Design an enzyme around this catalytic site. Structure first.
Site, PDB file in Angstrom:
ATOM      1  CE1 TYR A   9       1.411  -0.791   4.158  1.00  0.00           C
ATOM      2  CE2 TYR A   9       0.239   1.198   4.628  1.00  0.00           C
ATOM      3  CZ  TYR A   9       1.141   0.243   4.988  1.00  0.00           C
ATOM      4  OH  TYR A   9       1.767   0.333   6.198  1.00  0.00           O
ATOM      5  CE1 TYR A  60      -3.525   6.401  12.516  1.00  0.00           C
ATOM      6  CE2 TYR A  60      -4.745   5.435  10.733  1.00  0.00           C
ATOM      7  CZ  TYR A  60      -3.640   5.466  11.534  1.00  0.00           C
ATOM      8  OH  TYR A  60      -2.630   4.555  11.365  1.00  0.00           O
ATOM      9  CG  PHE A  76      -4.823   4.009   2.191  1.00  0.00           C
ATOM     10  CD1 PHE A  76      -3.479   4.037   2.451  1.00  0.00           C
ATOM     11  CD2 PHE A  76      -5.699   4.304   3.199  1.00  0.00           C
ATOM     12  CE1 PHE A  76      -3.018   4.358   3.694  1.00  0.00           C
ATOM     13  CE2 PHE A  76      -5.250   4.623   4.440  1.00  0.00           C
ATOM     14  CZ  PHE A  76      -3.906   4.653   4.691  1.00  0.00           C
ATOM     15  CG  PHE A  89       0.299   8.966   5.257  1.00  0.00           C
ATOM     16  CD1 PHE A  89      -0.683   9.362   4.387  1.00  0.00           C
ATOM     17  CD2 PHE A  89       0.061   7.895   6.079  1.00  0.00           C
ATOM     18  CE1 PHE A  89      -1.857   8.665   4.289  1.00  0.00           C
ATOM     19  CE2 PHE A  89      -1.111   7.194   5.991  1.00  0.00           C
ATOM     20  CZ  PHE A  89      -2.070   7.582   5.093  1.00  0.00           C
ATOM     21  CG  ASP A  90       2.155   3.934   4.900  1.00  0.00           C
ATOM     22  OD1 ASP A  90       2.769   2.849   4.926  1.00  0.00           O
ATOM     23  OD2 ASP A  90       0.959   4.075   4.587  1.00  0.00           O
ATOM     24  CB  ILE A 118      -8.403   2.645  10.431  1.00  0.00           C
ATOM     25  CG1 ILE A 118      -7.909   2.546   8.977  1.00  0.00           C
ATOM     26  CG2 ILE A 118      -7.426   3.389  11.291  1.00  0.00           C
ATOM     27  CD1 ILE A 118      -7.894   3.875   8.266  1.00  0.00           C
TER      28      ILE A 118
END
Lengths: 384, 357, 107, 780
Positions: free
Chosen positions: C26, C82, C99, C36-37, C56
């Site tokens: 992902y 979140y 995502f 972010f990631d 989540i």
């Protein structure tokens, strides 16, 4: 009010005294016991005096009328005075050891400590109040100690600086309201030029020793600098600078200062403000005690972080305080860090703000966890 | 314990291995002798292709550690080891034989003398600021090793530095150490020994804190002071009781006499507590022995101060109350030995007492 | 809620289920565009089992709708994300997440 | 813009360098929760790419290397470093096959060999930010294999061609080329990541000639010199570890043999102790000697003048002698690391004047270690404990708990850190290792680490920390005598700082029934404890009356609390420490207010009145408040412990016949101190009785609400201890009310219906402990 205080004041500036004969010529002659001399406090310009209100207070200069302020010096208590001589004089009194009493000349009042039994001695420091007495305690003797040249020079500088800045503050209050509009602002003219020159001289007086200098004199010079900063602090110079800054920053810009005190004065308002901030920076840079002295009024500097008049100076002040005190890190709250961050988004990309933020986190090798958090959660996530 | 104690056989291997490893250490590794200080100082001295020699660099670093402002000097094992290395370097019948040994010692002390050892020794002495730490135990020994035999060049350098620097703290620190020096203290002598008398040496119990631990420390400090004066450098003994250049002034000799008086009081009280008793235990025996040893050192120190005709020191004593101390010693001495004369087993103790007198 | 934007079609016969381990690579982003990631930068696929709420809730539902070998693009609104607190230091409060996931293997 | 463009755009270069500095700052000192956030902002990719990029400028190359170390490494590096300086060695079968010199006697390469020193592993955590939503957040992970080989490869790429003399530097200067890579390699080494082949590559790179125009030979600046100093320091530490482990291995084998001759000799004696009575009967001794002395006598043959001590066979002691020679050879007593370090350091020193102070310190530390190896071995041996193979995982739990503990002294203490330390302490206690191996916990400096934490917190906020720490220290005291002594040194601190449990409890526990420590009590400490009683003689804690309280003048609360410490400090092992007696009462009378509001002197009042106060004002709850505590019973506790302390400070009878004018005058001080009569009063001042019947109620008084029976027991103790009883008349007097009616009350409580009550039990202890023994004493 005079006191035989002890402990700290053995090494401060209000403890100094300056002997002065009542003869203008050959004043530097060796002291002869009983010459009608005159004692002058240096850091205040007051004279040890015999007044009716209290008996022993430091009267101002304008009332040392040769009775209240004339004194002799006596080896022993008994009764008996030599006319002054036009030569350097055969030495009688000696530094270090040779004991001597104090004898007023008007009413033979010797100088002994009162030593009553109030709660002042028990609660506060043991400060035996000083009073005059016809005889008093038979053990009122004095050891004479010399002061180093740096100490005396600093004392006199404190006297002049405090007088000048109090005059300046008086003026600033003299036009506190009262928009001059058209015409003169007030009666007295601000000592603007004297203030600027004194500020620059003092800034020179506190400059750090050169790094390139060797390691055996740099530490002596650092000790001297720390000592001089300590003297200036313990006589209110920090407070005087803070009060001048408070009086000036009330005006939002030079134009406002002109509307209250004329254009000819406002032409230098920015310069005076920058000099004041830089002097306040120098008084505290490195000295642990003076940096600790900003534990309470921290909000003060933070509240002023967003003045475009003197922006670098206040930032550098904050940087010094933060890096020379761990206790001020614990009192830091969220609003302070938010203000520091806002300084970035208002005044551009400047690395010193980042350095201040770094200093906010770790101190003396110990990490202030809450500061780390607050910075992380108030700065990073936006990524702007 | 008298009924039964283990063979090592029944101990599991884990305990036995440890008890082995804290016995192999003391019995074997400690007794081993390694003489490395000589080679370390011999090779650190050479600088083979204005640049300071390596040993000089080390000396300057250690000096910097002292000159830099630090309220309490922190234990630096590095200095605490290199100082002893230097000391061992300095330490090691015909007139020619004696003079050859003398020349060897002169060179050995002088190589450290040149590269700045005296200055760092004085600076560290100042830096200890009156505290009794192994710091001083090493610095004093190094200074003694440098000054052993009275290398007059060392005396000149130390006096010169202590003068020009005009430091007002060195003598204050020395005074603090000296007034913090211990004294026989018959009190604890009664206490622990009585306790020891009870003898609480239980299962794995340990009989052993000798009273006055810090005897070597005093014996070394006083020896250091004496070596500062040896050779009758009248100038140094002149500076001793009065600095005349520092902001204040301290008379070290009278403080030395003060410690002498304290020791006089202690031995005098020893005399009364022990007076009724006939034979003192071996513990009390060497208590008294080390007491006289420290006494011998202090008296040699005093002698040195006035050994040359330093009339100033002579008058300083002439007013001093040392008269009483020795007066006390008079009553202290002649009584002891009579009782000591009564004891045949204490003949060597009497010998030591006699040479003290 | 979550959405399924079929960036590339997978299989469509097999789907993740209860008690099965799904592996994903992902790469993720905020709604403005910041990232972010990414697993792909770390170089190791991410594992989780539909059911015990590792992640989540939104991510779990989104990966549950997907097929095997199907890249997609979930858009988890804050409530299934979140949420109001946000991951401190990474996700600002009340932020919407996007995502780019890819269900690689279903074991 | 491409990042390499931050080589002419200098302002952005500086800003970004300081941004990285800020990143390291916020992640500094264990803050893994922020380390995860930084993973999001600077990824595990960008880091590796920046590490393997040659065109990046210095302030960014070093910036990113240090950022990598801060995010991932320097939270396991500091912990692994803290525990590197101790040498627990499990007696595994593996550790047995460790010889100083590999068989084949030339030095094996440093840091290349089986090392069984019991270092715990370092945990990581994958960093993902999709997980659902505190326990200690571990450091973010990173593949520790590609990283290792990558560091080695770039180090190789930077070394020899680094000395190709090319004016092409990787990062703008030789310094910025080497310093970061060496930093990373040293950190990875300390972490224990590098295998043996990789370590051989590192050594071959440092100096290829001896370890098989290298690295040390080529030109060099100062900071890089400092970094090689760190590397060589690591290898020296590895060699030291090897010596210690070889000592452990030889200890194992040599003691497994050395017991065999002991059993054989015991068999030999048992078969032949006869025929030699009083000849071997002295030699049979050393089997009843304590074991440490036995071992010392066994290992007493080196000097060859003491060789009679050892009864060993010659070959066995030959084993030890050979090992000693091998140890000396390994310790030096180039072609080896020692000479390489020495020559390198001397050459650096004598080719330039070093202006970097820490560089000089490092140089001379290495030089000292490489001239004296035996000395560092002797200074490391104190930290060496051979634990059994079984107790190994327990030691891992212990060491990880200790790691967390000493990894929080670098962070100011909030609530989360408070909870973590309190959990860690509890985990420390529960290990059976803590019980079984006290010497080890003294060796790891445990009672010093926890002391340091307590000093920091006390130097109040976070009281539960002081409670937990002081309970831990009390257990440390209680575990064994050597611990007691250990902490007895800090008693000055532990006393001057004086809630349930308190540091004063630690001070008391230091000297519970230990004559050696009890006597050694310095007088000034006795004053310090009589101060804080002088310090509480005339006062009422403002920290107590924060709620509605009667606000009496004096405060027994702190009083009794201090008193009990003295009670321990004076009377031990069923007898008085009369040596520390005159100090007690003398010091108490110098502050003649400490004897209570009553018994001061002028203004003093009746002792029976002194308690009559409580007799009335305590029993009514009208004064205490409108629940922590009640009053009077604590006042009674004060006036109890005072008398108990004075009684305990009484000379013994055989010492009475010593005619000790000290002892007799102490008796006199006691006698004028309290009248000989008032005793019977307080003995006879009656207290309530349990709820016998009363409609089956529970009006049985609460102890904290009713009169201290042990107050009266202390009275009795003082009575029989200094005043004594010498005629049947006074015994009769006491029996009239003080003794017999108390017995009636007790046996009335003997009913199975009202005996379980606490008051009955307390009266039972009261009569058994002081009344009955006294009655036995006066029976003749």
């Amino acid at each position: 009010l005079v006191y035989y205080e002890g402990g700290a004041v053995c090494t401060h500036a209000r403890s100094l005294w300056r002997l002065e004969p009542l003869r203008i010529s050959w004043s530097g002659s060796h002291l002869r016991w009983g010459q009608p001399l005159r004692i002058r406090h240096v850091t205040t310009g007051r004279y040890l005096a015999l007044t009716e209100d209290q008996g022993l207070v430091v009267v101002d200069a304008c009332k040392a009328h040769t009775k209240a302020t004339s004194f002799c010096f006596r080896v022993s208590k008994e009764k008996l005075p030599k006319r002054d001589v036009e030569g350097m004089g055969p030495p009688e009194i000696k530094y270090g050891e040779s004991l001597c009493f104090v004898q007023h000349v008007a009413s033979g009042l010797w100088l002994t400590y009162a030593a009553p039994d109030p709660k002042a001695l028990r609660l506060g420091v043991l400060k035996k109040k000083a009073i005059l007495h016809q005889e008093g305690h038979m053990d009122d003797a004095l050891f004479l100690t010399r002061c180093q040249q740096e100490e005396s020079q600093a004392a006199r500088m404190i006297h002049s600086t405090a007088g000048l800045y109090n005059q300046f503050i008086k003026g600033l209050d003299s036009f506190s309201g009262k928009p001059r509009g058209s015409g003169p602002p007030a009666g007295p003219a601000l000592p603007i030029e004297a203030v600027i020159l004194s500020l620059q001289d003092l800034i020179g007086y506190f400059e750090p020793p050169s790094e390139e200098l060797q390691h055996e004199e740099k530490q002596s010079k650092l000790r001297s600098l720390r000592n001089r900063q300590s003297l200036f602090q313990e006589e209110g110079m920090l407070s005087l600078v803070l009060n001048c800054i408070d009086r000036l920053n009330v005006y939002t810009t030079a134009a406002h200062f002109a509307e209250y005190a004329g254009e000819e004065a406002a032409e230098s308002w920015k310069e005076i403000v920058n000099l004041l901030y830089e002097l306040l920076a120098s008084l505290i840079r490195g000295n642990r005690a003076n940096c600790a002295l900003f534990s309470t009024n921290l909000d003060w500097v933070v509240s002023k972080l967003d003045r475009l008049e003197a922006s670098s100076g206040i930032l550098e002040v904050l940087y010094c305080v933060l890096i020379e005190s761990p206790e001020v890190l614990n009192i830091i709250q969220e609003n302070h860090i938010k203000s520091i961050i806002s300084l970035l988004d208002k005044h551009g990309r400047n690395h010193k703000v980042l350095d201040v933020l770094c200093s906010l986190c770790v101190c003396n090798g110990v990490a202030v966890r809450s500061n780390q958090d607050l910075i992380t959660e108030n700065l990073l996530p936006g990524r702007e | 314990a008298c009924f039964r104690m283990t063979p090592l056989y029944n101990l599991p291997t884990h305990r036995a291995c440890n008890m082995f490893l804290e016995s192999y250490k003391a019995a074997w590794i400690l007794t081993e002798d390694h003489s490395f200080e000589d080679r370390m100082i011999d090779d650190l001295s050479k600088a083979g292709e204005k640049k300071p020699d390596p040993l000089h660099q080390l000396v300057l670093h250690f000096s910097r550690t002292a000159l830099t402002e630090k309220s309490k000097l922190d234990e630096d094992y590095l200095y605490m080891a290199y100082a002893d290395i230097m000391a061992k370097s300095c330490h090691l019948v015909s007139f020619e034989e004696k003079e050859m040994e003398k020349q060897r010692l002169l060179y050995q002390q002088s190589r450290l003398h040149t590269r700045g050892a005296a200055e760092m020794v004085l600076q560290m002495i100042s830096a200890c600021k009156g505290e009794t730490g192994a710091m001083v135990s090493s610095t004093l020994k190094l200074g003694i090793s440098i000054l052993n035999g009275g290398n007059a060049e060392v005396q000149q350098k130390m006096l010169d530095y202590l003068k020009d620097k005009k430091e007002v703290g060195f003598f204050q620190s020395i005074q603090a150490l000296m007034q913090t020096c211990s004294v026989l203290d018959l009190n604890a002598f009664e206490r622990q020994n009585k306790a020891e008398g009870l003898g609480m040496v239980n299962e794995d119990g340990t009989v052993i804190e000798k009273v006055m631990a810090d005897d070597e420390f005093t014996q070394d400090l006083f020896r250091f002071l004496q070596l500062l004066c040896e050779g009758h450098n009248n100038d140094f003994q002149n500076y001793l009781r009065t600095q005349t250049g520092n902001t204040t002034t301290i008379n070290i000799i009278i403080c030395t006499v003060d410690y002498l008086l304290r020791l006089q009081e202690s031995i005098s009280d020893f005399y009364w507590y022990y007076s009724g008793k006939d034979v003192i235990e071996e513990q009390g025996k060497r208590n008294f022995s080390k007491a006289m040893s420290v006494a011998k050192q202090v008296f040699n120190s005093l002698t040195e101060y006035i050994q040359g005709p330093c009339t100033g020191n002579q008058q300083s004593l002439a007013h001093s109350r040392l008269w009483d101390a020795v007066v006390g010693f008079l009553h202290v001495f002649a009584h002891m030995m009579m009782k000591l004369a009564q004891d045949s087993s204490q003949i060597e103790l009497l010998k030591e007492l006699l040479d003290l007198q | 809620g979550v959405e399924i934007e079929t960036i590339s079609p997978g299989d469509g016969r097999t789907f993740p289920k209860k008690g099965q381990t799904c592996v994903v690579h992902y790469t993720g982003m905020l709604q403005n565009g910041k990232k972010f990631d990414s697993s792909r930068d770390r170089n190791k696929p991410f594992k989780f089992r539909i059911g015990k709420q590792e992640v989540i809730k939104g991510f779990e539902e989104g990966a549950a709708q997907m097929s095997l070998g199907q890249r997609a693009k979930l858009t988890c609104t804050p409530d299934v994300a979140y949420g109001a607190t946000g991951h401190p230091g990474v996700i600002p409060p009340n932020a919407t997440l996007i995502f780019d996931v890819e269900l690689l293997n279903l074991e | 813009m491409d990042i390499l463009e931050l080589s002419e755009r200098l302002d952005l270069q500086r800003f970004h360098s300081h941004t990285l500095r800020l990143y390291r700052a916020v992640c500094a000192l264990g803050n893994n929760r922020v380390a995860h956030a930084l993973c999001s902002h600077v990824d595990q990719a960008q880091l590796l790419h920046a590490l393997e990029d040659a065109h990046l400028p210095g302030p960014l190359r070093a910036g990113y290397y240090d950022l990598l170390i801060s995010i991932h490494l320097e939270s396991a590096c500091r912990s692994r470093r803290s525990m590197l300086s101790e040498y627990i060695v499990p007696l595994t079968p593996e550790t047995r096959a460790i010889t100083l010199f590999p068989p084949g006697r030339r030095h094996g390469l440093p840091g290349v060999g089986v090392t069984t020193s019991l270092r715990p592993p370092h945990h990581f955590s994958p960093p993902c930010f999709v997980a659902a939503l505190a326990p200690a957040r571990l450091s973010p992970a990173i593949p520790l294999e590609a990283l290792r080989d990558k560091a080695l490869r770039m180090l190789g790429e930077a070394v020899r061609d680094g000395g190709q003399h090319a004016r092409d530097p990787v990062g703008g200067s030789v310094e910025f080329q080497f310093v970061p890579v060496l930093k990373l390699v040293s950190t990875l080494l300390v972490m224990g990541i590098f295998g043996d082949e990789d370590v051989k590559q590192i050594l071959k790179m440092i100096e290829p000639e001896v370890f098989t125009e290298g690295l040390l030979q080529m030109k060099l600046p100062e900071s890089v010199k400092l970094q090689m100093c760190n590397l060589l320091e690591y290898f020296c530490d590895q060699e030291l570890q090897h010596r210690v482990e070889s000592l452990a291995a030889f200890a194992e084998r040599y003691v497994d043999k050395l017991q065999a001759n002991q059993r054989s000799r015991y068999a030999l004696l048992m078969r032949a102790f006869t025929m030699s009575a009083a000849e071997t009967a002295r030699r049979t001794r050393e089997f009843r000697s304590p074991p440490q002395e036995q071992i010392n006598m066994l290992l007493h043959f080196k000097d060859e003048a003491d060789e009679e001590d050892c009864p060993l066979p010659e070959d066995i002691r030959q084993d030890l002698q050979d090992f000693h020679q091998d140890l000396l050879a390994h310790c030096g007593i180039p072609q080896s690391l020692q000479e390489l370090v020495s020559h390198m350091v001397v050459r650096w020193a004598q080719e330039d004047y070093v202006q970097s102070p820490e560089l000089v310190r490092a140089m001379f530390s290495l030089l000292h270690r490489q001239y004296d190896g035996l000395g560092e071995l002797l200074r490391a041996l104190p930290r060496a404990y051979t634990i059994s193979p079984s107790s190994v995982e327990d030691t891992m739990s212990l060491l990880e708990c200790l790691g967390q503990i000493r990894s929080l002294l670098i962070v100011q203490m909030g609530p989360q850190e408070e909870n973590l330390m309190i959990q860690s302490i509890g985990n420390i206690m529960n290990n059976k290792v803590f019980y079984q191996h006290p010497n080890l916990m003294r060796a790891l400096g445990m009672h010093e680490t926890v002391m340091e934490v307590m000093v920091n917190v006390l130097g109040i906020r976070f009281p539960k920390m002081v409670t937990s720490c002081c309970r831990f220290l009390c257990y440390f005291c209680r575990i064994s005598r050597q611990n007691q002594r250990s902490m007895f040194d800090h008693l000055s601190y532990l006393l001057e700082n004086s809630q349930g449990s308190t540091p004063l409890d630690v001070a008391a526990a230091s000297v519970i029934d230990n004559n050696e420590l009890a006597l050694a009590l310095q007088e000034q400490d006795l004053e310090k404890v009589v101060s804080y009683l002088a310090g509480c003689g005339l006062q009422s804690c403002p920290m107590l009356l924060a709620k509605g309280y009667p606000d009496i003048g004096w405060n027994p609360c702190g009083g009794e609390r201090y008193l009990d410490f003295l009670r321990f400090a004076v009377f031990v092992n069923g007898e008085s420490v009369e040596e520390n007696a005159n100090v007690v009462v003398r010091l108490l009378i110098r502050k003649p207010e400490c004897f209570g509001p009553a018994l001061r002197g002028e203004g003093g009042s009746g002792l029976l009145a002194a308690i009559e106060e409580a007799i009335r004002i305590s029993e009514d709850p009208a004064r205490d408040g409108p629940n922590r505590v009640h009053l009077g019973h604590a006042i009674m506790s004060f006036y109890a412990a005072l008398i108990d302390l004075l009684g305990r400070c009484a000379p013994e009878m055989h010492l009475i016949q010593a005619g000790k004018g000290e002892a007799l005058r102490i008796r006199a001080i006691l006698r004028s101190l309290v009248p000989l009569d008032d005793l019977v009063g307080i003995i006879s001042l009656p207290l309530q009785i349990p709820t016998l019947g009363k409609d089956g109620a529970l009006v049985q008084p609460k102890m904290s609400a009713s009169f201290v029976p042990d107050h009266k027991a202390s009275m009795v103790l003082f009575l029989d201890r200094v005043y004594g009883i010498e005629n049947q008349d006074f015994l009769l007097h006491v029996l009239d009310v003080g003794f017999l009616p108390d017995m009636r009350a007790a046996a009335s409580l003997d009913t199975a219906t009202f005996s379980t009550t606490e008051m009955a039990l307390a009266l039972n202890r009261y009569l058994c402990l002081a009344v009955l023994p006294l009655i036995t004493k006066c029976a003749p």
